[PDB]
Amino acid sequence: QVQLVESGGGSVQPGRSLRLSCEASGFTFEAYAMHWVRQPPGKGLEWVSSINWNSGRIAYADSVKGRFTISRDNARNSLYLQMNSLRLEDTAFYYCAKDIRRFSTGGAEFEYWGQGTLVTVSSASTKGPSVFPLAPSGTAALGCLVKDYFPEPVTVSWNSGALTSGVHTFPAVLQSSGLYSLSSVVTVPSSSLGTQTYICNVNHKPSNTKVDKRVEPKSC
Amino acid sequence: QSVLTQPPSASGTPGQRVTISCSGSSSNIGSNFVYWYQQLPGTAPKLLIYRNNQRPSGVPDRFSGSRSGTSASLAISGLRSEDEADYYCAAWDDSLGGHYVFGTGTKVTVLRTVAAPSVFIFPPSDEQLKSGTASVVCLLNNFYPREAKVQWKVDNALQSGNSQESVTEQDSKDSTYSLSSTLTLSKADYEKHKVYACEVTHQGLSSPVTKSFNRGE
Numbered sequence A: 001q002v003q004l005v006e007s008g009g010g011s012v013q014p015g016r017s018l019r020l021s022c023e024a025s026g027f028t029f030e031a032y033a034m035h036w037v038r039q040p041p042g043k044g045l046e047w048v049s050s051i052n053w054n055s056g057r058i059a060y061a062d063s064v065k066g067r068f069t070i071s072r073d074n075a076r077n078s079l080y081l082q083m084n085s086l087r088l089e090d091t092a093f094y095y096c097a098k099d100i101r102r103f104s105t106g107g108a109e110f111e112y113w114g115q116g117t118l119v120t121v122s123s124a125s126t127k128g129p130s131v132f133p134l135a136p137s138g139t140a141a142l143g144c145l146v147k148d149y150f151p152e153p154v155t156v157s158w159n160s161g162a163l164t165s166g167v168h169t170f171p172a173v174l175q176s177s178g179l180y181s182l183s184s185v186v187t188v189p190s191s192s193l194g195t196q197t198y199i200c201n202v203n204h205k206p207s208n209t210k211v212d213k214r215v216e217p218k219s220c
Numbered sequence B: 001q002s003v004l005t006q007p008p009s010a011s012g013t014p015g016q017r018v019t020i021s022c023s024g025s026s027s028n029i030g031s032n033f034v035y036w037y038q039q040l041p042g043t044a045p046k047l048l049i050y051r052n053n054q055r056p057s058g059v060p061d062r063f064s065g066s067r068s069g070t071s072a073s074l075a076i077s078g079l080r081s082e083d084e085a086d087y088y089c090a091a092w093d094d095s096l097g098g099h100y101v102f103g104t105g106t107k108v109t110v111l112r113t114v115a116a117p118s119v120f121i122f123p124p125s126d127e128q129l130k131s132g133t134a135s136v137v138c139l140l141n142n143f144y145p146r147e148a149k150v151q152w153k154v155d156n157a158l159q160s161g162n163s164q165e166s167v168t169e170q171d172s173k174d175s176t177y178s179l180s181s182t183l184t185l186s187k188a189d190y191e192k193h194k195v196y197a198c199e200v201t202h203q204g205l206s207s208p209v210t211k212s213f214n215r216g217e
């Protein structure tokens, strides 16, 4: 199975530099042109750069020409994007993509994409979240409140992935303070409350934060 | 600079045939292959159609593409709830020495039957109160359509300016939305009042529904 994993995202100040990487497995990396595509949150797709199998032919979109450098290490099955002189409008998910064709020299055909690394160009300071229980009131609703973090993104799972049904993890909203906040809620049967343990797992990779929060009913 | 234009949105009942335009110029679609990409909410784009009409393995045959001149079109036969996504066409553009152009994208939603939300209300945790701010959360679960009004009342006094909303994307299997609204008060203001109520107006409710709690009970 083809697999592409991007890393190197997180927050970065305007004017500064950031290097993204992509690890490729499940195919003969050194035979396929690789590309970077980016997507500003909520907006559309923009092609960034291309490099063929031996790095002989390289292409850049005009919006990054002169600031970004694409490269690759076939022995390490890795693709790199060096980003200099970053601007707010460079804030985006950056996607690593593999070409359909072997040994091509031009064009682009994005056959498989990595899930992307989110780059936030901002003057704000990185800050990890605080996590509070949304304790439950035969449907009963419980959740976790992930408040006052920056930048995006947060991931939330329930019982380390052993609970998937009824789970709604809402899009983050930017508070007036400049920090983000979201809720993840799951509807379970009330029969389950005294019987089952519900833990929300919050990951905030930009601040290197991992928190597990037991969410129990209230005493009353 | 060069743009492939698509309709901003598209919709259909389950089983309906949806069709998405992609309008280009003689420099891109008129000369080069067209590709279509599908992006489910919160995921990365997928290759859906390549070289005008080819489908990868793992793409159902209800997706098909065609190219006629400077325009291209994607067709989804028998729209399913799992098809709710953004769809982007794309093609190489020969002008200006060469560049790849993505289309402006089309959001595809499923038209289902009106469904009223379920409302749940959450008091702030005691742990958050120890830090001096209170967050009250109102949850509107599994409703359709998307538009909804949340109105906070504190001892029946309507609030304004101290709340924020967030809405999910359309659900992959039942085509509903959910909504969270958060009321943020200082700890001191939170303890000065007793009844916290969130009042919900929606097309599925003939009269507004109110869920509330008394602080400290």
Ligand SMILES: CC(=O)N[C@@H]1[C@@H](O[C@@H]2O[C@H](CO)[C@H](O)[C@H](O[C@]3(C(=O)O)C[C@H](O)[C@@H](NC(C)=O)[C@H]([C@H](O)[C@H](O)CO)O3)[C@H]2O)[C@H](O[C@@H]2O[C@@H](C)[C@@H](O)[C@@H](O)[C@@H]2O)[C@@H](CO)O[C@H]1O
Pocket: A100, A101, A102, A103, A104, A105, A106, A107, A108, A109, B031, B032, B033, B092, B098
């Ligand atoms: C060789 C090369 O990279 N030329 C690019 C050019 O890309 C090519 O365009 C033609 C059509 O004009 C064709 O689609 C090429 O694809 C194929 C082929 O049929 O030759 C597809 C095959 O699957 C593939 N074979 C394998 C085993 O993977 C071969 C093969 O990779 C090459 O022939 C070299 O061995 O390629 C395609 O590669 C490129 O054109 C643009 O991009 C294309 C992907 C397509 O969208 C075109 O319509 C579009 O104009 C141009 C860009 O200016 O640059 C040339 O250098």
